[PDB]
């Protein structure tokens, strides 16, 4: 492999939940879950991130139903939330 894929955010809870789904690091679906995570990070609005969060979960839930994405989503949303 010329290079190894990676993200600045680096989520262990999300990655751990797909491991529960038993997807391969190179599986397309594995990529879909990771990509949707990245998409959430790309979302500049709560609504945009929300749609991406459900998309991410849509892949995970559909895959097997592993539980942990809620922690990522609820914490992610918390991060998006601000007093300002």
Summary?
The PDB classes it as viral protein. Helix content is 65%, strand content 0%.
Description of the structure:
With 84 residues, this protein is an all-alpha fold. The protein has one domain. Helix content is 65%, strand content 0%. The longest helix has 18 residues, at 46-63. Plays a role in viral RNA synthesis. Forms a hexadecamer with nsp8 (8 subunits of each) that may participate in viral replication by acting as a primase. Alternatively, may synthesize substantially longer products than oligonucleotide primers.
Topology:
Layout: H1 12-21, H2 28-42, H3 46-63, H4 69-80
Helix pairs in contact: 2-3, 3-4
Entry keywords:
84 residues, mainly alpha, 4 helices, globular, Non-structural protein 7, viral protein, covid-19, nsp7
What is the count of DSSP helices, taking H or I runs of 4+ residues?
Answer: 4
How many domains make up the coordinates? 1
Shape: globular
Order of helices and strands: HHHH
Number of strands: 0
What is the percent of helical residues?
A: 55-70%
Radius of gyration: 13 Å
**In what range is the share of β-strand residues?**
under 5%
SS content category:
mainly alpha
**Largest beta-sheet characterization:** none
Subcellular location: Host cytoplasm, Host perinuclear region; Host cytoplasm; Host endoplasmic reticulum
Domain RdRp Nsp7 cofactor: 2-84
Protein name: Non-structural protein 7
Organism: Severe acute respiratory syndrome coronavirus 2 (2019-nCoV)
């Amino acid at each position: 492999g010329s290079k190894m894929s990676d993200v600045k955010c680096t989520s262990v809870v999300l990655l751990s939940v797909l491991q529960q789904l038993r997807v391969e690091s190179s599986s397309k679906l594995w990529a879909q879950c990771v990509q949707l995570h990245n998409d959430i990070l790309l979302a500049k609005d709560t609504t945009e991130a929300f749609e991406k969060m459900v998309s991410l979960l849509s892949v995970l839930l559909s895959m097997q139903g592993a539980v942990d994405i809620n922690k990522l989503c609820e914490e992610m949303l918390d991060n998006r939330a601000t007093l300002q």
